[PDB]
Design a protein around this ligand. Structure first.
Ligand code: 2Q0
Ligand code: 2Q0
Ligand code: MN
Ligand code: MN
Ligand code: MN
Ligand code: MN
Lengths: 321, 331
């Protein structure tokens, strides 16, 4: 047709345990609840295509059974709503590509793009969609990397995708797993680290660019619409002010693309700032934590001598800096 | 035109292909002269696939060790497995009873793949599952996979035997609730193995053939390298491997099994010969003048692999392995 409704979510980080150094907190229950809201909104808005990018699994090379089980489960829940296109992150298990290709071959409701080669998928209402994938470069690239030709290598493939995008029928969607050049704020870096790609190098002829790997929601540009949806939960206190969720994108053949943020409303984070820890502050911390339904961080400047076991008496206090 | 299952009214027939113990990724005789069996194994597998398409089987059963390495299969072995898995699925619906693997993620992937496809089913528990055959026949699978802890630490004695028996009785009762056909799938060693070879061996699950539910139309077994017609009622068959893995399988005949089922008539079956490379063991007291002439003459135009067995050394042995590419083992 001439219309395409898309749900784009990324960076689920299934299996994550936060603040393992100070107070380990399994985010599974919170994550699943947020993950459920995204699924419900997919069915409610009746999306035609679902895009998955970023780190769906927290552990790159050692995911737990439970984490893997949650992944496959939510993959299936997504598939029952609309056809799914997945751009996996970088995993060194070379058998993963075999699995992805196998699953892609046996189901018409899911596609795993694990190369730079474009793939023509079919949306829920029959819309033809050309996927332009740009995953983390294999080696290949890290082997022939000299900083100079490596940048030229990336541009070549980006130019190749541009040429392939011109061959589109109905819609063309770009999917990339990298960090856009010019990010000073998260920017969790690096050092390192992942591949840096400039905005203008993204094929302008695509209808939408689906990005991942970033915890925080970022609207990179409008033409073409380039978006990091962000994670579904607040992984750490750097994301305290962030709003977490997924992205609903709608496309028309002639009209400009529009999008909305789908709030997952995960648990809130709070950082309390003190000059020093004294009697008044000690009571202030205990009082706030008992009334706060989220997780709390406490940072203070001046040394306050011996500190009472706060991370042993306050289940809500997860970090002291 | 279409590529989905047919639906025939009042159809009381079921054509089955049963193959087992592929051992993909295997390299033989790594201690004397390593030989990659991949090309030979793939050649046999293609023959089995073509025989499925030719006979237009309604269902495909896979048992035993499709992968040689239980805990660390290579990328190439995994690729071949998934490839041939896809080839079977194009022909007819597939039911897989996997041998116990060390990895714990296999259960998740198997269940995931099963949930998203209607042309492949992974049975990895004792629970029965109803599957649909190529022409719409309802088939109830009664799976008997390798037990789990349980076996470790096997505590204790006959309590484990009563556990196995209880499970088998459960499968029997569920087999009685069949709609059309019922098929037993098991990964164990039948008591009274007569006789090749017993090894394996190795810490195995032994079950008498009488304990296998008699109300099933066919009992698909695996894990044994040699073809075995255990019994005729219910028809119980180890298909055997597709290649001769070691010299204990020299007199073996390797292949798969085609089974045809009818409501009123007893089951008939034909062996699908894979025709793999032959093996041969050469016996000598000591490798002397006569023995050298015998070995060289035989290996000359023998299309398979040869093992030479002798008892005592007698002078420096000539470079027979470098001279004879057929000779893979002089122990
Ligand atoms: C095969 C896909 C349907 C789901 N999926 C996995 O199962 C993955 C498994 C995985 C990834 C990394 C690793 O070290 C072990 C397993 S990644 C991914 S996407
Ligand atoms: C469930 C199917 C995809 C077939 N299949 C595998 O992919 C398997 C993968 C595997 C097995 C053991 C291992 O150490 C790593 C991967 S086993 C098996 S049967
Ligand atoms: Mn990432
Ligand atoms: Mn991430
Ligand atoms: Mn076995
Ligand atoms: Mn075997």
């Amino acid at each position: 047709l001439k219309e395409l409704k898309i749900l784009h979510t990324s960076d689920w980080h299934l299996g994550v345990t936060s603040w393992t150094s100070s107070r380990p907190v399994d985010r599974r229950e919170e994550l699943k609840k947020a993950l459920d809201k995204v699924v419900e909104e997919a069915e409610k808005r009746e999306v035609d295509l679902i895009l998955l990018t970023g780190d769906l699994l927290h552990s790159r090379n050692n995911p737990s059974v439970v984490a893997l089980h949650d992944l496959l489960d939510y993959l299936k829940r997504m598939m029952r709503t609309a056809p799914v296109v997945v751009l996996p992150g970088n995993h060194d298990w070379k058998g993963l590509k075999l699995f992805g290709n196998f699953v892609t071959s046996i189901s018409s409701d899911i596609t795993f793009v694990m190369s730079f080669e474009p793939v023509d998928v079919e949306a829920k209402r029959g819309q033809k969609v050309r996927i332009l994938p740009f995953p983390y470069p294999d080696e290949s690239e890290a082997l022939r990397k000299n900083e100079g030709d490596f940048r030229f290598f990336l541009e070549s493939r980006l130019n190749k995708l541009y040429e392939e995008a011109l061959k589109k029928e109905d819609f063309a969607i770009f999917m990339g797993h990298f960090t856009v050049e010019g990010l000073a704020g998260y920017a969790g870096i690096e050092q390192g680290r992942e591949i840096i790609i400039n905005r203008a190098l993204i094929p302008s002829v695509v209808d939408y660019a689906a990005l991942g790997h970033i915890h925080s929601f970022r609207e990179i540009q409008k033409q073409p619409l380039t978006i990091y949806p962000g994670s579904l939960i607040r992984i750490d206190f750097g994301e305290e002010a962030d709003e977490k969720g997924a992205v609903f994108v709608e496309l028309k053949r002639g009209e400009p693309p529009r999008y909305e943020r789908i709030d997952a409303s995960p648990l809130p984070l709070k950082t309390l700032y003190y000059k020093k820890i004294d009697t008044s502050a000690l009571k202030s911390i205990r009082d706030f934590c008992r009334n706060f339904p989220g997780y709390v961080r406490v940072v203070y400047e001046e040394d306050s001598g011996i500190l009472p076991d706060l991370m042993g008496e306050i289940d809500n206090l997860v970090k002291i800096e």
